């Protein structure tokens, strides 16, 4: 299909041409002629390499232009939002307002009412709906990217919830990877189903086993070692992407590869890779990233700061970096994609990476511009080669299961309905359930109903809600406030129960430990080695905490380690020193800090709700200290367009 055969305003055809696009891939055309341009819902299940995002932009803009209103683009993580924001800029050339909303859960954000295209994570949008933002009624279409994450135990329930709220109120467009139950999800969505595996560049998938790669077609190719695939790819001017399961693993493998890749890097690239390694902020975690990069290979994982990760990502794109070793969470295309591990550590033991995931990983092979073929190789270190092939190259992807039973999401969601959506009867809350994907999969209805009755009891006991002998459920201040803060009802419960202790002794350690013990935060882990030190410091500072005795406990000390880290953060300990002293990386530090700000904020708000107004100012000063990791006497110099503990501290001196 030629962009000009597209029955849409010239403004869109014009913007695409400027983009170099003149025609659509067969999968794109099928999607564009399925009814999405006429408002129908649709579920697009095709390779990422086939431009799922373009089908969404076109249907969004066409939607707005033909009927005013706004378009919502829901993104998986508040990090794939800035990239969606950059690529959605060219829509402003035709007068479209593109906004990005990610955090700050406690606000209606009425300022978004003047934008046409809004990008947000599922959580952020879920809370906007709770706050009842004025403009939401103007949303005419919502696009959910990687909609298949609805099957994620963690946050899939949130995505399901907002989708359940929006179905039949706006056009819904889902973008997903291949899954086992495409038609079931499409039906629940009352959507057109577009399933395809057509891709621009041919994809050859194989398995590397003891000196050889066996491709799906049947042929065999010798390779002395899996790493040789990388080396070969690099010698051939192409690049390589290698997936691993652990951070340190990614780090060991990156440094390793780089030790033999450097002898393939012309003077320019080595010269450049050095100007590159020297630009990295200084800290342990980067020192490593440094050595590897000067060698041409880099590692990529959550333990690295946002910037570092961006620097890697783009330079791999720029091609200045020949290969990047990365973990899954937070993972451009490459000629060769190597999956070096097929077993990952879960709390359920070491398990095999899901099929849906391996496919998504192999699908990143083959750059439209530079390749006549893309190759994805799974490395079988100690698995039956044939079994690996049959399970990951010829096995149906997993079927998506509603993750609505996730007790933490459900408890927070049952209250949200009562406290911000006016549900007042169990039977009415059940009506909501009936429109969810859980209800549509006809999954165990009884068990869900009982978990909800129990949850209502929990909420009724802790005074978030109230009931009548007529059984009319109505929310109370703490209920409404909790729901609007987006925190788990249980962390609110934990704040409420300890509010007397906090006002009796307001202090950093106590608070950080308290918040780091709730469900809304993932405390730092600790090893067998340091645990010794943690115990002494604990018993040395048990007076400042708000809990009697851990025993009378793993999370307790994780939270306690976290309380110490944050404490050093507010006391301006240099990043690098914190990384060292507590064995933690700047990625987790920024993540935890950012979450602590949110959580110390929510404690202030819950304090307001419970009369403890005398600690409000303190917690407020604590919130700001946590956000920038600074002493109070610097909070003024924080205003600036940008500075931080960085210069600020020096300035003040």
Author numbering: 1 to 331, 336 to 556, 564 to 664
Provide the authors' own sentences about this structure as they appear in the paper.
Pyrococcus furiosus Hjm (PfuHjm) is a structure-specific DNA helicase that was originally identified by in vitro screening for Holliday junction migration activity. It belongs to helicase superfamily 2, and shares homology with the human DNA polymerase Θ (PolΘ), HEL308, and Drosophila Mus308 proteins, which are involved in DNA repair. Previous biochemical and genetic analyses revealed that PfuHjm preferentially binds to fork-related Y-structured DNAs and unwinds their double-stranded regions, suggesting that this helicase is a functional counterpart of the bacterial RecQ helicase, which is essential for genome maintenance. PfuHjm folds into five domains (domains 1 to 5) with dimensions of approximately 70 × 50 × 30 Å.
We obtained the two different PfuHjm crystals (Forms 1 and 2) in the nucleotide free-state, and determined their structures at 2.4 Å (Form 1) and 2.0 Å (Form 2) resolutions, respectively. In the Form 1 crystal, the C-terminal 60 residues, about two thirds of the C-terminal domain, are missing in the final model, presumably because of structural disorder. The structures of the two apo-forms are quite similar, with a root-mean square deviation (rmsd) of 1.05 Å for the corresponding 651 Cα atoms. The Form1 crystals were obtained using ammonium sulfate as a precipitant, and it was found that five sulfate ions were bound to the protein. Notably, all of the sulfate ions lie on possible DNA binding surfaces. Collectively, these results indicate that the sulfate/phosphate ions mimic DNA backbone phosphates. For instance, a sulfate ion is strongly bound to Arg306 and Arg309 in domain 2 of PfuHjm. Two point mutations (R306A or R309A) in PfuHjm significantly decreased the DNA binding ability (Fujikane and Ishino, unpublished data). However, the C-terminal segment was invisible in both the Form 1 and Form 2 crystals, suggesting that this segment is highly mobile.
